[PDB]
Ligand binder design. Structure first.
Ligand SMILES: CCCCCCCCCCCCCCCCCC(=O)OC[C@H](CO[C@@H]1O[C@H](CO[C@H]2O[C@H](CO)[C@H](O)[C@H](O)[C@H]2O)[C@H](O)[C@H](O)[C@H]1O)OC(=O)CCCCCCCCCCCCCCCCC
Ligand SMILES: CCCCCCCCCCCCCCCCCC(=O)OC[C@H](CO[C@@H]1O[C@H](CO[C@H]2O[C@H](CO)[C@H](O)[C@H](O)[C@H]2O)[C@H](O)[C@H](O)[C@H]1O)OC(=O)CCCCCCCCCCCCCCCCC
Ligand code: CLA
Ligand code: CLA
Ligand code: CLA
Ligand code: CLA
Ligand SMILES: CCCCCCCCCCCCCCCCCC(=O)OC[C@H](CO[C@@H]1O[C@H](CO)[C@H](O)[C@H](O)[C@H]1O)OC(=O)CCCCCCCCCCCCCCCCC
Ligand SMILES: CCCCCCCCCCCCCCCCCC(=O)OC[C@H](CO[C@@H]1O[C@H](CO)[C@H](O)[C@H](O)[C@H]1O)OC(=O)CCCCCCCCCCCCCCCCC
Ligand SMILES: CC1=C(/C=C/C(C)=C/C=C/C(C)=C/C=C/C=C(C)/C=C/C=C(C)/C=C/C2=C(C)CCCC2(C)C)C(C)(C)CCC1
Ligand SMILES: CC1=C(/C=C/C(C)=C/C=C/C(C)=C/C=C/C=C(C)/C=C/C=C(C)/C=C/C2=C(C)CCCC2(C)C)C(C)(C)CCC1
Ligand SMILES: CC1=C(/C=C/C(C)=C\C=C\C(C)=C\C=C/C=C(C)\C=C\C=C(C)\C=C\C2=C(C)CCCC2(C)C)C(C)(C)CCC1
Ligand code: OEX
Ligand SMILES: [Cl-]
Ligand SMILES: [Cl-]
Lengths: 32, 448, 37, 62, 336, 240, 60, 34, 144
């Protein structure tokens, strides 16, 4: 099950990379 | 960005705020281009990773690898995949290229110039400038022509293109004599779209395929130079709406036609879409069933030519309404199907009876047997077979996915023409927001 | 499959093709952050 | 070279993730494209160097 | 003012003073629809039987040949023809054209051009009257459905004989065979189509009942309430706030459209979007991408298959499959 | 088109033209079958292209002069028998005996009589055994049932498969009115064909001529009386 | 054969032109309609009140 | 049947030509707004 | 039912059709590629038979102007020649394998050039191309 664990881990980053950008801009008062 | 307070467009029509922001509109189009290249790269690597050599391409749900195979990458004689490394570098090259394409999209969208008309007159444009619009049309017309010449260069100088009709079996072949005769080219273009004719979907040689792309490459280059050195004439100026949304609707109508044509190409054509990679077509599978039962019943002992069905028509062999000897049954409708495994048994008058009972090669039987079981029939959840079948086989033909999807895209982009072209005329005329309460046109008309 | 040198990185490839559909949702969450101005 | 190649590929993935989040953040930030523009170019340059490094190392490992 | 023949002709064609607007799409719509109408009426009354399956077994579809209004139909083109173009001039005799199902192709081909031109003619009048141009977009939904069952489904299946017969009982045969081969009921797009028409029927009844319930008193009880409205009124004939108040209490305040413009867009979008998908559903099933197949999906611990309601549907689908086109199949698989 | 001319054409140059439904023409050659060396040849590429279909109709004008009225073809170019093989025996005295074995040897044809009556028939030379001289050599052939034993009628009734009664009529089914229709038979019949040799090419081993065939029509699995169909046309064969 | 027919079905002819007379039918009709249209363009444009210069046509 | 084919080709070309040159006749200018 | 003795059907491959329709078997086994690679003797036999067709049937077809027969003969019983030539050439030593591949490409170019002339219905150029094809094939077989 190491394969699916790695797939979910990689999936966790990418589904968070997007919102990570928005929250950083929202917190830092960015031009978003 | 902007808001509805200063633009009048809500968030759900937000990209309409870019109509006159040429700089940001550039980044929008470059960013979507990065997405297209990203998907091509990501889906290519996804298919390469999930590729098992013990099955054919069409049994693994691959739609991009067949496109690479038809270009003659990593395929040996007979449609056998020998090496998937060329498929790998195709995915990597697109994936990396999407990054720089994505950066330019993000740069030209978020922090680049909003309008290019001031700082960069070469790239700046206003939709009303018909001359400038034609130059952009002319320029991008040349790169399309050059892209077409890449295909013929691949087919004539760089390895070649996979020919499913090649003598000695389907293989990668160098095209040395492309068919550039005007009669052949015009014959395909102005052919009927009905049965037997099939418009351009009936191109059945790689000589005609890359012969046509020579014409397309040349026409687009000359058309590019033409539309660069000339501005639209008076007849055109009084026939088209010269607005940014109007130009979009013209393209939407165009690629709607292209979407429908790709749907029919993937469904019927066996030259540009070899059955070795995309699987059998609808007509091919039905034609393969009667061929399979003709072969197996001969061994059991039966005169297939003299065998009658319940209806009195030939059980195995009958005549088309034009006289050609064809396979019997319901597949009488598919009598205009032509395939690499079936043409050797076909003479000038149709299927040759002597060759059908004396010279059926084992490879022809194996091809027809394989094509019958992989008929383009399946369910939404990818259950192979007719709707009245058990959950045993996990298979839907790539032709089914390609034809079904690009018809839905073709139809919706036709609604794009209807929507974006209707609005283009109304906005230019100036009543896209509603009827003037004090100046209603109908109120000034004679009653019916 | 991928070349043997790229085998450890296979799980990343298995989630890559779904990224483009995330951009549509990313645009939606971006508009929500700015209160759909 | 297999371990060297995979380390370079992993480094390429990590720096790509930094650019995927870092670049839009600094671009949207008003001061970002004026001050952090220097460190973005370093990230772009390193990213391209790893592309070519992984590219040549692919020849000796595949 | 105009003196040129073409200048005067183009003014007449685009004239909004005609009782029925012609326009440029009408010079295509009128001849095609009249051609299809003429042959349809003549064929529905007096056409000879048609060998639809290509097995030399003609099927009677005319009133003068023993059918009533329900069972009468224009039989599709012969299976021997397939998708081949079969105009009347490609037949040796008009008797042969009738026998092979010629009138069906003539109707379907001219009718498809008629509805496409009818759609454009709807845009053209809106432009001539200075109104917003999207009634034609809402009309694209029924056009897509008509195009799917007359053109695209025969295209994917390989024969015009698989198109919908131009008749009442012929339509039912089309649906039943369609279920047996594609399991259309289990397809998510007929599901969206059903929600489109059930919802559209619901929304039509609700909007009609809510507006009728809110009519402002302007008449007596010995007169129709309709008399309270005068054609050309500048004021509203019903109280929108009162109707919103009723429906607000009926479920909850924010489940109701306070905006007439939003409400009417919803009234248009819901059925049009639903019919778009069910039209796509038939188009997708034309290329044999059938609906969900959950047969033998549930099996017990030892492997025994436990039937579900989906398996009972398969039993009904099995019965239609082995009976449609009884004499047409010589081989076990229905690949065509 | 001679046989050599046809073989010089691609399938795409024939598809749709209609020449696929034409027997090859034997040009040059000779008019004397005597040029054929006596012996037993192997009949090959035997093909019979009709040139006319006439159906005998009982005369309502009394007199009993039932004559073959002209018809209109209804099923398009699907009516030539080809690829028929067998043996052809030539005698020194000019005696000719032809025997068909395999090949198409049958084609469903429908024609329409004056009045709108479609008469189907199974144009066939099955088991054709013709003996005679060169000028005329005739024989009888088997005309099988137009509809097979497993053909289901619109009510689901058949011979070897289907209902044996009118299920739509639970009570009046199996009455004397429906006994004839409920019971179906697929027995065969016989026809008479007279052939004639007009051209013979000894060098290429090819013969040609005309034929006249008279056979019954479809009996609707025994539901209707068969009419008499006279088929006149050309024929061609390759002795080898 | 027994009957006569055009036999042009499924033959891939350009615009369906089996015989050259069909070419004259299409060409003559198109030329006539084009002829009456051509001698009327100026009058039609005159109604616009603008001259068909490089800035003529519906433009947003 | 050729006579019928030529008649239809004449008729179809006539109505299509009117459609084509109809929209080329400053169609966009035929609107009630200014 | 009445019985019939079709036990000979398995000979001459009654199960070839059933073998190709077996999803359990790999694609190589279904298509017959695995059998030829495993037993090279059948691959060599089909090369010899393909040579017989080329050095016999083709000459008659060109002389009689039977263009469709000639093209079909180039793809029937020869439709596995490219695979069979590759199958034998793979077993050769690397030095010989390189030379066999070069020879094979020359023969394939000639047979495709011959196919063009048959398509063009050019008897004179086809006969010249046929003679070249027969010469190239002999060189390839000698190396294999
Ligand atoms: C007001 C605003 C309103 C907004 C409304 C918004 C609504 C959003 C609706 C979304 C509906 C789609 C939901 C997607 C997630 C569902 C899970 C899923 O999808 O899962 C389904 C499967 C599961 O993955 C795998 O799918 C495979 C499918 O077979 C494929 O692979 C097989 C080999 O294993 C065979 O090779 C076979 O031939 C080949 O088809 C197998 O079934 C595997 O066992 C299975 O694990 O696909 C996959 O997840 C991977 C593919 C998923 C994406 C595919 C997109 C491309 C579609 C192309 C065709 C488009 C249209 C066709 C017409 C449709 C008509 C309805
Ligand atoms: C007017 C009313 C009729 C509208 C068109 C109906 C005919 C469309 C059709 O039957 O077919 C559309 C044609 C495809 O036609 C098919 O083209 C095929 C071409 O394959 C042939 O050639 C191939 C070449 O490899 C193969 O050899 C193949 O085996 C061989 O059969 C066959 O000839 C079929 O008989 C033929 O029907 O494509 C096309 O024109 C693409 C353009 C039409 C797109 C679909 C229509 C969408 C319309 C509104 C939405
Ligand atoms: C390359 C083609 C293209 C381009 C460049 C545009 C561009 C534009 N469109 Mg248009 N449109 C197109 C195609 C295109 N459209 C098609 C094909 C249709 C038919 C469906 C439409 C229907 C349409 C309408 C009704 C409207 C526009 C509008 C607009 C403007 C603003 C839209 C916006 O802000 O997006 C915002 C994006 C969203 C709010 C998200 C949309 C959600 C969709 C449904 C995602 C669903 C994805 C899913 C996979 C689809 C399932 C089916 C699929 C499998 C086929 C803009 C200039 C608006 C306008 O008129 O501007 C003035 C407007 O209202 N378009
Ligand atoms: C292919 C899809 C696409 C693209 C390319 C664009 C592009 C654009 N949109 Mg748009 N939009 C889309 C879809 C898209 N949109 C959809 C589906 C909707 C409906 C919800 C909208 C609704 C919408 C509205 C309402 C508006 C726009 C606006 C804009 C423009 C400026 C956005 C901005 O500056 O704000 C800033 C955004 C951010 C700061 C957050 C995004 C940060 C980055 C870009 C996220 C991506 C990170 C990426 C992975 C990094 C990798 C790149 C590289 C390092 C490899 C821009 C050119 C605005 C406009 O019109 O300009 C006047 C605006 O008003 N859009
Ligand atoms: C979710 C959106 C989506 C997706 C995922 C796809 C996906 C796909 N589409 Mg599709 N399409 C879409 C939307 C989409 N489409 C829409 C909205 C439309 C308009 C309605 C279309 C219209 C369309 C058409 C007309 C066609 C496709 C096709 C395809 C398939 C091949 C893609 C391709 O090769 O393109 C193009 C590739 C490029 C642009 C990159 C290559 C460009 C250069 C010039 C090629 C040079 C190659 C060269 C010879 C290589 C040799 C090396 C060289 C150095 C010598 C693919 C699976 C094709 C198909 O398979 O038909 C079914 C096809 O014909 N699509
Ligand atoms: C595919 C991209 C493309 C696009 C978007 C355009 C767009 C345009 N072209 Mg162009 N053109 C192109 C490619 C393109 N062209 C190519 C590749 C060539 C070389 C053959 C030409 C040669 C060309 C000429 C000679 C002319 C135009 C003209 C025009 C303008 C008038 C449009 C029109 O009425 O045509 C609509 C189509 C028809 C009226 C009939 C189409 C019939 C075709 C030929 C066959 C039937 C299908 C228009 C803006 C005209 C212009 O304004 O001059 C600047 C003009 O006279 N183009
Ligand atoms: C300038 C004036 C006239 C230009 C030529 C007009 C077309 C020639 C007559 C039509 C014709 O039969 O062409 C015949 C030519 C000759 O080419 C032959 O054509 C035959 C019928 O079209 C068949 O297609 C044959 O395959 C082909 O060899 O082919 C064309 O149809 C090309 C016409 C389109 C290009 C015209 C020039 C632009
Ligand atoms: C997608 C486009 C597919 C067709 C592309 C070729 C067009 C020419 C063509 O179809 O040939 C015409 C074909 C061929 O026509 C047939 O051809 C056969 C041989 O292939 C036979 O000869 C038949 O007798 C002949 O009728 O079919 C038609 O006749 C249909 C023409 C109908 C025109 C409708 C115009 C609709 C309005 C358009 C408005 C302008 C825009
Ligand atoms: C290639 C690759 C890469 C890259 C990646 C990327 C580019 C990513 C991106 C991604 C993205 C781009 C993401 C995003 C996503 C999004 C999301 C996750 C969201 C969602 C949302 C939701 C779900 C919700 C919505 C809503 C709102 C809030 C409003 C109202 C309504 C609703 C609720 C619906 C990496 C680095 C890995 C490395 C390796 C390779
Ligand atoms: C403007 C804007 C928008 C959009 C945007 C976009 C659309 C972007 C795109 C972007 C992009 C388009 C990006 C891309 C990226 C990519 C990358 C970054 C790559 C990576 C790669 C890597 C990292 C590596 C990989 C590998 C190889 C090399 C081999 C195999 C293995 C692997 C896979 C690992 C939105 C909507 C938000 C709204 C707002 C505005
Ligand atoms: C590559 C290739 C080929 C082909 C080629 C070509 C050469 C194409 C072309 C095409 C062309 C060359 C053309 C087409 C099309 C066009 C179109 C489709 C359109 C038209 C449109 C429109 C839109 C019109 C309009 C109008 C006018 C007149 C103006 C205004 C008014 C109106 C709107 C009415 C082939 C087949 C060999 C196959 C292989 C590949
Ligand atoms: O044609 Mn009317 O229904 Ca369409 O599936 Mn196959 O083909 Mn016949 O059977 Mn089932
Ligand atoms: Cl039925
Ligand atoms: Cl069948």
């Amino acid at each position: 099950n190491l394969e699916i664990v790695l797939q979910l881990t990689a999936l966790l980053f990418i589904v968070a990379a997007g919102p990570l950008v928005i929250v950083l801009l929202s917190s830092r008062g960015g031009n978003l | 960005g902007r808001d509805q307070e200063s633009t009048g467009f809500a968030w759900w029509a937000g990209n309409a705020r870019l109509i006159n922001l040429s700089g940001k509109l550039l980044g929008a189009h470059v960013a979507h281009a990065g997405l297209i290249v990203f998907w091509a790269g990501a889906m290519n690597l996804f298919e390469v990773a999930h590729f098992v050599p013990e099955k054919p391409m069409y049994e693994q749900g691959l739609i991009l690898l067949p496109h690479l195979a038809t270009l003659g990458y990593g395929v040996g004689p007979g449609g056998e995949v020998i090496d998937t490394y060329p498929y790998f570098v195709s995915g990597v090259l697109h994936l990396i290229s999407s990054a720089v394409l994505g950066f330019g999209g993000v740069y030209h969208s978020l922090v680049g110039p909003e309008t290019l008309e001031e700082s960069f007159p070469f790239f700046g444009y206003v939709w009303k400038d018909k001359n400038k619009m034609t130059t952009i049309l002319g320029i991008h017309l040349i790169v399309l022509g050059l892209g077409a010449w890449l295909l013929v260069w691949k087919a004539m100088y760089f390895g070649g293109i996979y020919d499913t009709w090649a003598p000695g079996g389907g293989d990668v072949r160098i095209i040395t004599n492309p068919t550039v005769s005007p009669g052949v080219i015009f014959g395909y273009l102005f052919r009927s779209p009905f049965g037997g004719d099939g418009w351009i979907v009936s191109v059945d040689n790689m000589e005609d395929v890359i012969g046509g792309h020579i014409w397309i490459g040349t026409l687009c280059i000359f058309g590019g130079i033409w539309h660069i050195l000339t501005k639209p004439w008076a007849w055109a100026r009084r026939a088209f709406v010269w607005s940014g949304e109007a130009y979009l609707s013209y393209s939407l109508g165009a690629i709607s036609i292209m979407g429908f044509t790709a749907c029919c190409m993937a469904w019927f054509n066996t030259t540009a879409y070899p059955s070795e990679f995309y699987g059998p077509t609808g007509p091919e599978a039905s034609q393969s069933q009667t061929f399979t039962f003709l072969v197996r019943d001969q061994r059991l002992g039966a005169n297939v030519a003299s065998a009658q069905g319940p209806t009195g028509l030939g059980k195995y062999l009958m005549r088309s309404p034009t006289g050609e000897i064809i396979f019997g049954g319901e597949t009488m409708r598919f009598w205009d199907f032509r395939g690499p495994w079936l043409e050797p048994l076909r003479g000038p008058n149709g299927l040759d009876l002597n060759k059908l009972k004396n010279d059926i090669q084992p490879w022809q039987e194996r091809r027809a047997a394989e094509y019958m079981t992989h008929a383009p029939l399946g369910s939404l959840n990818s259950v192979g077979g007719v709707a009245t079948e058990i959950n045993a086989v996990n298979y839907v033909s790539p032709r089914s996915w390609l034809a079904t999807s690009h018809f839905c895209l073709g139809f919706f982009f036709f609604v794009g023409h209807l929507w974006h072209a209707g609005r283009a005329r109304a906005a230019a005329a100036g009543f896209e927001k509603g009827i003037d309460r004090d100046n209603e046109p109908v109120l000034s008309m004679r009653p019916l | 499959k991928l070349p043997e040198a790229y085998a450890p990185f296979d799980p990343i490839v298995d989630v890559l093709p779904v990224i483009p559909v995330l951009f549509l949702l990313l645009a939606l969450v971006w508009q929500a952050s700015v209160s759909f101005r | 070279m297999l371990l060297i190649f995979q380390l370079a590929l992993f480094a390429f993935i990590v720096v790509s993730f930094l650019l995927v989040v870092g670049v839009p953040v600094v671009l949207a930030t008003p001061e970002g494209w004026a001050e952090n523009k220097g460190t973005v170019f370093s990230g772009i340059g390193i990213w391209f160097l790893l592309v070519f490094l992984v590219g040549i190392l692919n020849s000796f490992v595949v | 003012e105009s003196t040129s023949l073409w200048a005067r002709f183009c003014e007449w064609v685009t004239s909004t003073e005609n009782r029925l607007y012609i326009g440029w799409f009408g010079v295509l719509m009128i001849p095609t629809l009249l051609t299809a109408t003429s042959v349809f009426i003549i064929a529905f009354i007096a056409a000879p039987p048609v060998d639809i399956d290509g097995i030399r077994e003609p099927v009677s579809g005319s009133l003068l040949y023993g059918n009533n209004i329900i069972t009468g139909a224009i039989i599709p083109t012969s299976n021997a023809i397939g998708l081949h173009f079969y105009p009347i001039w490609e037949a040796a005799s008009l008797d042969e054209w009738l026998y092979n199902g010629g009138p069906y192709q003539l109707i379907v081909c001219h009718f498809f051009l008629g509805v496409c031109s009818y759609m454009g003619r709807e845009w053209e009048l809106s432009f001539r009257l200075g109104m917003r141009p999207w009634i034609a977009v809402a009309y694209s939904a029924p056009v897509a459905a008509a195009t799917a069952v007359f053109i695209i489904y025969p295209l994917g299946q390989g024969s015009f004989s698989d198109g919908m017969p131009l008749g009442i009982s012929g339509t039912f045969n089309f649906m039943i065979v369609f279920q047996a081969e594609h399991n259309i009921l289990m397809h998510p797009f007929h599901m969206l189509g059903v929600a489109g028409v059930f919802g559209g029927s619901l929304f039509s009844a609700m909007h009609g009942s809510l507006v009728t319930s809110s009519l402002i008193r302007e008449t007596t009880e010995n007169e129709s309430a309709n008399e309270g409205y005068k054609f050309g009124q500048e004021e509203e004939t019903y109280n929108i706030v009162a109707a919103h108040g009723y429906f607000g209490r009926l479920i909850f305040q924010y489940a109701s459209f306070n905006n007439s413009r939003s409400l009417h867009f919803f009234l248009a979008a819901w059925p049009v979007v639903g019919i778009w998908f069910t039209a796509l559903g038939i188009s997708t099933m034309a290329f044999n991408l059938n609906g969900f197949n959950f047969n033998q999906s549930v099996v017990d611990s030892q492997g025994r298959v436990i039937n579900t309601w989906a398996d009972i549907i398969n039993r009904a689908n099995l019965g239609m499959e082995v009976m449609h086109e009884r004499n047409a199949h010589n081989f076990p698989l229905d690949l065509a | 088109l001679t046989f050599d001319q046809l073989q010089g054409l691609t399938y795409l140059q024939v598809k749709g033209t209609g020449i696929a439904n034409t027997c090859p023409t034997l040009d040059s050659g000779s008019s004397n079958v005597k040029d054929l060396k006596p012996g037993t040849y192997k009949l090959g590429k035997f093909c019979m292209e009709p040139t006319s279909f006439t159906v005998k109709e009982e005369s309502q004008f009394k007199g009993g002069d039932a004559e073959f009225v002209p018809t209109k073809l209804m099923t398009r170019l699907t009516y030539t028998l080809d690829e028929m093989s067998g043996q052809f025996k030539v005698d020194g005295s000019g005696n000719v005996e032809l025997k068909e074995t395999d090949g198409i040897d049958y084609a469903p044809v429908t024609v329409q009589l004056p009045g709108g009556e479609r008469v189907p028939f199974l144009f066939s030379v099955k088991e054709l055994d013709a003996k005679g001289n060169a000028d005329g050599f005739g024989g009888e052939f088997v005309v099988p049932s137009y509809r097979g034993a497993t053909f289901l009628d619109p009510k689901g009734r058949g011979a070897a498969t289907g209902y044996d009664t009118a299920v739509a009529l639970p009570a009046a089914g199996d009455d004397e009115e429906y006994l004839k229709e409920n019971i179906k038979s697929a027995g065969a019949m016989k026809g008479q064909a007279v052939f004639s040799i007009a051209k013979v090419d000894a060098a290429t081993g090819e013969i040609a001529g005309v034929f006249e065939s008279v056979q019954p029509s479809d009996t609707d699995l025994g539901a209707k009386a068969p009419k008499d169909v006279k088929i006149t046309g050309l024929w061609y064969a390759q002795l080898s | 054969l027994v009957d006569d027919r055009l036999a042009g079905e499924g033959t891939g002819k350009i615009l369906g032109i089996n015989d050259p007379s069909l070419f004259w039918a299409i060409t003559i009709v198109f030329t006539i309609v084009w002829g009456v249209f051509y001698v009327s363009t100026r009058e039609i444009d005159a109604a616009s009140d603008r001259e068909n210069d490089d800035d003529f046509g519906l433009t947003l | 049947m050729l006579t019928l084919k030529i008649f239809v080709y004449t008729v179809v070309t006539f109505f299509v030509s009117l459609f084509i040159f109809g929209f080329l006749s400053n169609d966009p200018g035929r609107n009630p707004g200014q | 039912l009445d019985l019939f003795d079709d036990r000979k059907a398995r000979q001459a491959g009654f199960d070839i059709i059933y073998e190709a329709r077996d999803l359990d078997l790999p694609q190589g086994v279904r298509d017959g590629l695995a059998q030829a690679r495993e037993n090279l003797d059948v691959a060599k036999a089909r090369i010899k038979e393909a040579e017989k067709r080329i050095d016999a049937d083709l000459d008659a077809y060109i002389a009689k102007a039977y263009w469709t027969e000639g093209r079909n003969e180039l793809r029937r019983q020869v439709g596995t020649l490219r695979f069979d030539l590759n199958a034998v050439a793979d077993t050769l030593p690397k030095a010989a394998k390189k030379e066999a591949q070069a020879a094979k490409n020359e023969f394939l170019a000639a047979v495709e050039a011959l196919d063009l002339q048959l398509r063009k219905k050019n008897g004179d150029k086809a006969a010249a191309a046929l003679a070249d094809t027969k010469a190239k094939l002999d060189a390839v077989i000698a190396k294999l």
